[PDB]
Design a protein around this ligand. Structure first.
Ligand SMILES: C[S@@+](CC[C@H](N)C(=O)[O-])C[C@H]1O[C@@H](n2cnc3c(N)ncnc32)[C@H](O)[C@@H]1O
Length: 318
């Protein structure tokens, strides 16, 4: 019988390679004109110490290196892109530093000279964070970094360092969404109460390899001199999370989950009364100032009742 020919090594390597690329679910930006645009929209990187997260092939890395950068540190998790990055460092004498690490855990507190550090109320320091990461990494990273801004530590020991990151279109939308909008949610409050957030532009998915199912939003973030809420991050996070869980219901329904059932009617009413908020407002209409009132009242309630802050309504429902 006539059987199909054997696959060559080229075909075997191709079959493994193409499937290895799809395996980590990423979107490479090979358009140097686009990576130039991201860098351009981020502002002037002249004499700025730049931290790039997940450089990969090095598209943005190249665009950063061509921008009068004082120094560029990159942290790369995949060791397969490390050789090419080293090659790129060779073309730029003393401009590139490479680390094989995880951005979710790597500390940059001392990666740059302490002299470039600035006061919080000062102008933003000569540190800038830029990166195009996979969607699974970018989302928890900003949430980690928002908490760092709250604590004024981590990347923000240098001061109010800027961020220019890519997010999936919908996430980028929520980050900048104003009150009343359908995309106004947790990320909206969590980012805006700590940062000035600007949606620079949106890159269509066609420009990425391989092609993602969605478009990619480019967002610029700058920490505020005075945060809109002055409570612990985890407290703000819990109130915001509970407020937005039932989107089609009165905010009273969601905020009520902060309190044990035996006190829920009275405490939820008291919370909204003291915070001076209409109990019938849908969560989408809750502004940063509404949450400041909710958080401040909830804080006083927690200080009065130490059982309150670690209450979880799911555990009670079981
Ligand atoms: C979609 S590529 C982006 C690279 C570049 N922006 C581009 O498109 O040309 C994402 C890169 O980030 C790296 N990466 C993913 N998760 C990471 C993590 N947790 N820490 C550090 N790097 C990570 C991967 O190695 C991958 O090369």
């Amino acid at each position: 019988f006539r059987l199909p020919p054997l696959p060559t090594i080229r075909e075997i390597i191709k079959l493994f390679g193409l499937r290895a690329v799809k395996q980590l679910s990423q979107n490479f930006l090979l358009d140097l004109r686009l990576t130039d645009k991201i860098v351009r929209k981020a502002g002037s990187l002249a004499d700025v110490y730049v931290y790039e997260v997940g450089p990969g092939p090095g598209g943005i890395t190249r665009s950063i290196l061509n921008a009068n950068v004082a120094e560029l540190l990159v942290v790369e998790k995949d060791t397969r892109f490390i050789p090419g990055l080293q090659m790129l460092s060779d073309a730029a004498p003393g401009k590139l530093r490479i680390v094989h690490g995880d951005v979710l855990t790597y500390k940059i507190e001392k990666a740059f000279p302490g002299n470039i550090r600035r006061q919080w109320e000062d102008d933003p320091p000569n540190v800038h964070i830029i990166g195009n990461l996979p969607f699974s990494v970018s989302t928890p990273l900003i949430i980690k970094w928002l908490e760092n801004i709250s604590l004024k530590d981590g990347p923000f020991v240098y001061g109010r360092t800027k961020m220019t990151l890519t997010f999936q279109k919908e996430v980028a939308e929520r980050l900048v969404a104003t009150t009343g909008s359908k995309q106004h949610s947790r990320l909206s409050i969590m980012a805006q109460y700590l940062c000035n957030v600007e949606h620079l532009f949106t890159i269509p998915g066609k420009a990425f390899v391989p092609k993602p199912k969605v478009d990619v939003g480019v967002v610029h973030l700058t920490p505020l001199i005075e945060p809109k809420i002055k409570q612990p991050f985890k407290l703000v996070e819990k109130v915001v999370q509970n407020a937005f869980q039932f989107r089609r219901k009165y905010c009273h329904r969601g905020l009520g989950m902060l309190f044990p059932e035996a006190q829920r009617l009275e405490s939820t009413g008291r919370l909204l009364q003291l915070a001076d908020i209409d109990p019938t407002l849908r969560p989408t209409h809750l502004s940063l100032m509404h949450f400041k009132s909710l958080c401040d009242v909830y804080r006083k309630m927690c200080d009065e009742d130490p059982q309150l802050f670690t209450y979880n309504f799911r555990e009670e429902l079981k």
